[PDB]
Curated annotation (Swiss-Prot), chains A, B:
Keywords: Cytoplasm, Dioxygenase, Iron, Metal-binding, Oxidoreductase, Phenylalanine catabolism, Repeat, Tyrosine catabolism. It is found in: Cytoplasm. The gene is HPD. Residues 12-158, 183-335 form the VOC domain. This is 4-hydroxyphenylpyruvate dioxygenase. The lineage of its organism: Eukaryota, Viridiplantae, Streptophyta, Embryophyta, Tracheophyta. It is an enzyme of class 1 (oxidoreductase). It catalyses: 3-(4-hydroxyphenyl)pyruvate + O2 = homogentisate + CO2. Fe cation binds at H186, H260, E346. The keyword Metal-binding applies. Its EC number is 1.13.11.27.
Amino acid sequence: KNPKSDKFKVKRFHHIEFWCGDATNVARRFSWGLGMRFSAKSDLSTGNMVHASYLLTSGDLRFLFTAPYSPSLSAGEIKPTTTASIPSFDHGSCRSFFSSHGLGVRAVAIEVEDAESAFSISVANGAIPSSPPIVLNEAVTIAEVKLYGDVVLRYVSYKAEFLPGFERVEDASSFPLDYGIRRLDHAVGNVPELGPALTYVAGFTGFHQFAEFESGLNSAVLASNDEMVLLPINEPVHGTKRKSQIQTYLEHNEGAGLQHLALMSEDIFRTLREMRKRSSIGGFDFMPSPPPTYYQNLKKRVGDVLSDDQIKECEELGILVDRDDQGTLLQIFTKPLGDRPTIFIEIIQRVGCMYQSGGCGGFGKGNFSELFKSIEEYE
Amino acid sequence: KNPKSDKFKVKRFHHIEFWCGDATNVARRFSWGLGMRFSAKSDLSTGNMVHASYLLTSGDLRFLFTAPYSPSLSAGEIKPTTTASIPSFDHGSCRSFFSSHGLGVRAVAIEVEDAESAFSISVANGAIPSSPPIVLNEAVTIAEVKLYGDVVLRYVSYKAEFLPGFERVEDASSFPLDYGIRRLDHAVGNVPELGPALTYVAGFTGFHQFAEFESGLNSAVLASNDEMVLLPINEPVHGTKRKSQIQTYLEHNEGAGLQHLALMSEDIFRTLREMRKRSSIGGFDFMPSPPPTYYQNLKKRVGDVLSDDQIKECEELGILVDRDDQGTLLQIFTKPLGDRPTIFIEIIQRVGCMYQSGGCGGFGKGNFSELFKSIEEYE
Ligand SMILES: CCN(CC)C(=O)N(C)c1ccc(C(=O)Nc2nnnn2C)c(C(F)(F)F)n1
Ligand SMILES: CCN(CC)C(=O)N(C)c1ccc(C(=O)Nc2nnnn2C)c(C(F)(F)F)n1
Ligand SMILES: [Co+2]
Ligand SMILES: [Co+2]
């Protein structure tokens, strides 16, 4: 049941902003590991004496990597006279964020019809303001409200090139990498208690609950009107045998924050082939493959959507497949993106629901015991 | 004139330690950009609840990348009960270092006959203690004294595998990259005033001055007895036409620190070919090539050591060559390794002085006007 209760008009994920200590090194690692291209920059070469920001993009996906310079470079400026292209940026907030959380996402940014109305309506419905609406170059307005822990939801709208103040990087410094990933599918937070986290976020957005046809966690998914913007949220279930990786997240992250970004690819087999080739030469590593008892048991679960030639292809790459009432889902997980066992990336491709409807296949909830039973069948 | 006045027995560069905010992402970028292999680790998988440290090595060169975890993971430990494998590590120092300087070198580590005597003799001759000698697993002793700004000189000695507490990483996670770089040649600091910086460092080491057969800077080089350990130091010359890149360093770095690491390669042409191939896919970029007026004018300067077939090879890669009284030197510079225009890397190969004697060829001092005259000859 989709009541379409969005309190304002939201279009689609716009970008994800990472707060790091060195933007260049993280951005270069991500660029090579994920086959994202170097798109735009704001830094000292563009007159930005405040922060260094680098945008990677592939398909519609935009990853923004930001880090602070020395405050001494901008000591004489004031907020109206600033050179920062992200007006919400602040040195102490950024330093306090990275020192507290390690590498992680600061903002999940959705495009809206009008950011200032989206900001006004939001706080009027309970959102905690983070940065009030600011109009950039009479062309883009930007506003931020708190989402959970230290991550904010960032509203973006254009009257009418990424953002004012950003230059387009040299064509020779830009190399057209592409491993098939195309857009952000969903972004998932971990919180100490989901109920208040849901009430608050559903409270100011009007997002509705998505259908979700020892766990380790309890989860629930928030969705815009066309179910394109999807914001799941997990919580721990204290008392299981094996300590919950959600609670593990909370202790190493110092509280709530973004757990994983799920990136959809137009060809998951080719994406995984190219990311796997780079695992040990600077890219990303993946979580251990499941035992073949799993892939042996899958013909009896998805043999209608997939030829056993390509289910074999799934066992090579360690891909995971599940199915909901309407579609089936292929998914695999990277190991944590940095030092701490916190934020990781999911690669997904969804088939069905045709002009594809959001959420087609669910989020792999059935895999918890599809893997557990599989582990048991081996031993 | 080499008086051999070293106040204690120093063998050779041991390692370089980088303090970052995320050790993994910097280490992966460096590994791919420089063709260094993943060698050893100390982190949560090795029981280290304090810091994450990753060693890359190629030839005799060892790059150590360290970042702090949340202090909450180790809140109950005390210095005798610590799990840190680098006993000198401290959370506040590390966080204050990276927030102040950006990515940069914290320690230049030289191997000695006996670290505690080297530490004792050093401070007795003026060194400012940083971390007193500590014996690791009755097998390695470690001590640190201040060198300039916030970088320390780290003494290492073995009675008799990198350091106690470090495990050797899995062979499948280790990929045998190698672009020909083999050992560290010299490491160069920038300071506000060189005289006091030299007096102090020459004061506690006994290192002697190396021969150095609008500048932009004034420099001087410190050398151990066999002139293997080389510690140059630059200072600005205020008042030139173009602002001194040394002073530029000091303002963006927030004071003194390490300016460049010079890595020697067994085949600079192949090193540069392989690093250049990766410039735009995650590696390192190089400073703009010189105009061919330079390479046209070089036959009349080094045509005896190099065939014009390989001087052509030098013009492709933008390599730079100079010569001293005994040897000739090939060198090229990377752009800064991170966000700030601070620390960069030099690649070098030295021919001559044969069983090769340190410093063979100098440090490219003649290139300042070999490039200036060349720039003028074009225009
Ligand atoms: C190998 C270990 N491993 C992942 C670490 C698993 O075993 N399993 C069973 C899964 C399966 C799906 C998802 C997921 O993606 N859920 C989701 N995505 N959006 N909303 N939700 C709720 C997650 C995750 F990522 F949340 F933890 N774990
Ligand atoms: C392209 C711009 N550019 C480098 C940025 C230059 O134009 N020139 C002329 C040089 C030449 C050599 C060295 C060097 O390596 N000197 C050294 N090494 N050890 N001791 N010393 C004193 C340096 C450096 F790296 F110090 F700045 N600059
Ligand atoms: Co997911
Ligand atoms: Co040099």
